[PDB]
């Protein structure tokens, strides 16, 4: 029970923020390969 | 070379009829979503 | 057929040929990219598989089928769907997840009751770990508590070949403490949970990357075949067109000549 | 005779394709020059004058009526053909039949999408 797990968050979510921050700290040379990775295409299907 | 846009619909061929049905399917599913969203904007 | 029917049909199929040719090239550049991205993803995904493939693990079952939303890729969807229903009839309470709308299309009439959730927007941008994460999160925090599970997908082999495979998900956090996992025993439940979650994302990421490479290669082939078939039809119709074209001139002219002679 | 004496008649011309052929033979052998498809120049008129005789009469003329169902044979589905187009352009509506539909099990083989009739009096029925 870490501060984030008590908040109802998973290691998936924790790891996603950590991963994003490492990308957001790259310089404009490796930052070009932010785009091709780190997407949000897939969507849920309700009703 | 020569312009030919819309030739598939123009033929009334299988491919033509299929595309017409495919558009209709898409926009009837859109209408369902849009009328519900309009119902919930109603209050 | 009439000259006007032939002409209209010729123009349609010429348009179909151009498009299928263009989409073959699109799929080719997309496939090349997928196959590059598959290289590190295979090392990663197989490394995540090492735990279960070094230990005899046994044991509500969860079937995750992986394809895409997009048509014209040969037997990509039928393959996975065929093993989904095949393994479902062999198992003993079954719930099904489909990733890619084409999964739901094939199975709905018979397995509609067994569907937990569906995912769409698959096959447009190359999948990421984010996408694996989104599926992962919408399964753990959804409500269904599975004892065992398996993921079914197309494993890439070459430009023209792929194999429909199944990987297990023992993600049941209860089964991680059994017979062969007895040597992994000092870990508190908190970290095993974090491990279990991450490995659930890894195996879905692995299936996503393999499936996409297979799907793009199969899309390339289907479009290549489509445009070759269209070109053959074009060739045949052009011959009929020219014959008919000449015959209309001939027919017309004989009518005018008859009309002139009769005066 | 029914139309004009206060009664109602239905006439079927089965078919007008074969009448045009006979008209073409007769006219050619009279040495009247051959027109489009060797038909006489006035093949339209042959059919337009006939079908215009179907009519609904007012009460001062007896209230009678004559309805016509002409029949046209197309070749390989070609409604754009000369004689078919003439008669399509004359009639109030048309019932289009198709081989594909016939063999698919659609019998009567009516193409509902293409088939047309003029409005309908308010009275076709009311529960219908």
| CATH architecture designation of the largest domain in chain C | 3-Layer(aba) Sandwich
- Assign the CATH superfamily of chain A: ATP synthase, F1 complex, epsilon  subunit superfamily, mitochondrial
Fourth-level CATH superfamily of the largest domain in chain C = ATP synthase, F1 complex, gamma subunit
* Global geometry of chain A: flat
Tally of extended strands of chain C? 5
Percentage of residues in helical conformation of chain A: 25-40%
Major pleated sheet of chain A: none
CATH topology descriptor of chain A: Atp Synthase Epsilon Chain, Chain: I
* Radius of gyration from the alpha-carbon trace of chain C, in angstroms: 27 Å
User: What is the succession of H and E elements of chain C?
Assistant: HEHEHEHEEH
- Identify the overall geometry of chain C: elongated
Distance between the termini of chain C: 33 Å
What is the radius of gyration of chain A computed over CA atoms, rounded to a whole number of angstroms? 14 Å
What count of domains describes the coordinates of chain A? 1
Number of strands of chain A: 1
Order of helices and strands of chain A: HHE
The proportion of strand residues of chain C reads 5-15%
Would you tell me which CATH topology of the largest domain in chain C applies?
Pyruvate Kinase, Chain: A, domain 1
- State the end-to-end distance of chain A: 35 Å
Give the biggest sheet of chain C.
Answer: 5 strands, mixed
Structural notes for this entry:
This is part of a larger assembly, with chains A (47 residues), B (43 residues), C (263 residues) and D (128 residues). Chain B has 43 residues and is mainly alpha-helical. Chain B has a single domain (1-43), classed as Single alpha-helices involved in coiled-coils or other helix-helix interfaces. Chain B has helices at 7-10, 14-41. Chain B is elongated. Chain C is of the alpha/beta class and 263 residues long. Chain C contains 5 helices and 5 strands. In chain C, β2, α3 (101-111) and β3 form a beta-alpha-beta unit. In chain C, α2 runs parallel beside α3 and α4 packs across α5 (189-262). Chain D has 128 residues and is an alpha+beta fold. Chain D is built from 4 helices and 3 strands; from the N terminus they run βααββαα. Chain D is flat. The relative contact order of chain D is 0.16. The chains are: A mainly alpha (47), B mainly alpha (43), C alpha/beta (263), D alpha+beta (128). Chain A binds chain C through residues 1-2, 5, 10-13, 15-16, 19, 36-45, and chain C through 99, 101, 104, 117-122, 124-131, 133-138, 140-141, 190, 193-195, 197-198, 200-201. β1 (43-45) of chain A pairs antiparallel with β3 (115-120) of chain C. Chain D: Belongs to the ATPase alpha/beta chains family. Chain D: The record marks 115 as: Required for activity. Chain D: The modification N6-succinyllysine is found at residue 7. Chain D: The modification N6-acetyllysine is found at residue 7.
């Amino acid at each position: 029970v870490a501060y984030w797990r008590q908040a109802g968050l998973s290691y998936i979510r924790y790891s996603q923020i950590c991963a994003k921050a490492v990308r957001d700290a790259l310089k404009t040379e490796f930052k070009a390969n932010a785009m091709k990775t780190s997407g949000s295409t897939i969507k849920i299907v309700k009703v | 070379v020569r312009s030919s846009a819309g030739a598939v619909r123009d033929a009334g061929g299988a491919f033509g009829k299929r595309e017409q049905a495919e558009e209709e399917r898409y926009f009837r599913a859109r209408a369902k979503e849009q009328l519900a969203a309009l119902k919930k904007h109603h209050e | 057929a009439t000259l006007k029917d032939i002409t209209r049909r010729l123009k349609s199929i010429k348009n179909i040929q151009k498009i299928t040719k263009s989409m073959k090239m699109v799929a080719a550049a997309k496939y090349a990219r997928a196959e590059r991205e598959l290289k590190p993803a295979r090392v990663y995904g197989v490394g995540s598989l090492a735990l279960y493939e070094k230990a005899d693990i046994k044991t509500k079952h969860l079937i995750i089928g992986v394809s895409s939303d997009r048509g014209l890729c040969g037997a990509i969807h039928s393959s996975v769907a065929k093993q989904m229903k095949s393994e479902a009839a062999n198992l003993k309470e079954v719930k099904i997840i489909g990733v890619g709308d084409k999964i739901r299309s094939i199975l709905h009439r018979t397995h509609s009751d067994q569907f937990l959730v569906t995912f769409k927007e698959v096959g447009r941008r190359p999948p990421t770990f984010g996408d694996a994460s989104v599926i992962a999160l919408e399964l753990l925090n959804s409500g269904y508590e599975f004892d065992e599970g398996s993921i079914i997908f197309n494993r890439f082999r070459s430009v023209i070949s792929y194999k429909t495979e199944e990987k297990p998900i023992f993600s049941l956090d209860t089964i991680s403490s059994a017979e062969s996992m007895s040597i992994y025993d000092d870990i508190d439940a908190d970290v095993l949970r974090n491990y279990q979650e991450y490995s659930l994302a890894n195996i879905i990421y692995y299936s996503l990357k393999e499936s996409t490479t297979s799907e793009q290669s199969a899309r390339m082939t289907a479009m290549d075949n489509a445009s070759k078939n269209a070109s053959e039809m074009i060739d045949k119709l052009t011959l009929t067109f020219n014959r008919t074209r000449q015959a209309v001139i001939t027919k017309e002219l004989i009518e005018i000549i008859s009309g002139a002679a009769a005066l | 005779y029914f139309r004009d004496n206060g009664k109602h008649a239905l006439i079927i011309y089965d078919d007008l394709s074969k009448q045009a052929v006979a008209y073409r033979q007769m006219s050619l052998l009279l040495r009247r020059p051959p027109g489009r498809e060797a038909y006489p120049g006035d093949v339209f008129y042959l059919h337009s004058r006939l079908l215009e005789r179907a009519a609904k009469m007012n009460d001062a003329f007896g209230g009678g009526s004559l309805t016509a169902l002409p029949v046209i044979e197309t070749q390989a589905g070609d409604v754009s053909a000369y004689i078919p187009t003439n008669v399509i352009s004359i009639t109030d509506g048309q019932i289009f039949l198709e081989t594909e539909l016939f063999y698919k099990g659609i019998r009567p083989a009516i193409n509902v999408g293409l088939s047309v009739s003029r409005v309908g009096s308010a009275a076709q029925t009311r529960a219908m």
